[PDB]
Design a protein around this ligand. Structure first.
Ligand code: AJO
Length: 151
């Protein structure tokens, strides 16, 4: 499982870096100890092997799988186009869109790690436990994913 988490990290990193250069909006939520099955069930089931290639193809704009969140559970991309709870926090900047609000929302009610790619800026953001790491560098993203996902 140790190699699966590292492959998960590398897949997120490659897909997000690919989509960030192209300003392709993306929203990837990795479940952890708390189940996210209710929101998996809101999307289109994939139950697919994790890969950067599939993550990218899912988020291509105007495609059947892009409008929503990808939820990763265990060693599978469980679903795409899932809905996530939107945070009601007035602290979150109005310059950020609903992807960040969804990413903040799910982080308030689960211990899940959620990664966002802004289609406006290409900035990669991350949410965990109700907090937002906005516009992280590749180094910062790699350290956070290593810390939070390799357990
Ligand atoms: C991934 C994503 C993108 C845009 C909006 C949302 N979330 C909602 O629309 C909130 N619903 C009403 C609750 C649920 N589930 N999620």
């Amino acid at each position: 499982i140790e190699r699966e988490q590292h492959h998960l990290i590398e897949s997120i990193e490659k897909s997000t870096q690919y989509m960030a250069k192209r300003r392709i909006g993306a929203l990837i939520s990795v479940a952890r100890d708390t189940g996210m099955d209710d929101y998996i069930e809101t999307g289109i089931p994939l139950n697919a092997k994790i890969s950067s290639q599939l993550l990218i193809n899912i988020f291509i704009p105007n495609t059947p799988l892009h409008d929503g969140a990808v939820i990763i559970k265990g060693n599978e991309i469980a679903s795409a186009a899932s809905y996530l709870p939107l945070s009601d926090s007035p602290f979150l900047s109005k310059e950020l869109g609903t992807r960040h609000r969804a990413a903040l929302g799910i982080s308030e009610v689960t211990d899940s790690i959620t990664i966002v790619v802004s289609e406006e800026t290409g900035g990669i953001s991350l949410t965990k436990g109700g907090e937002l790491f906005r516009d992280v560098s590749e180094e910062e993203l790699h350290k956070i994913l290593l810390k939070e996902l390799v357990t």
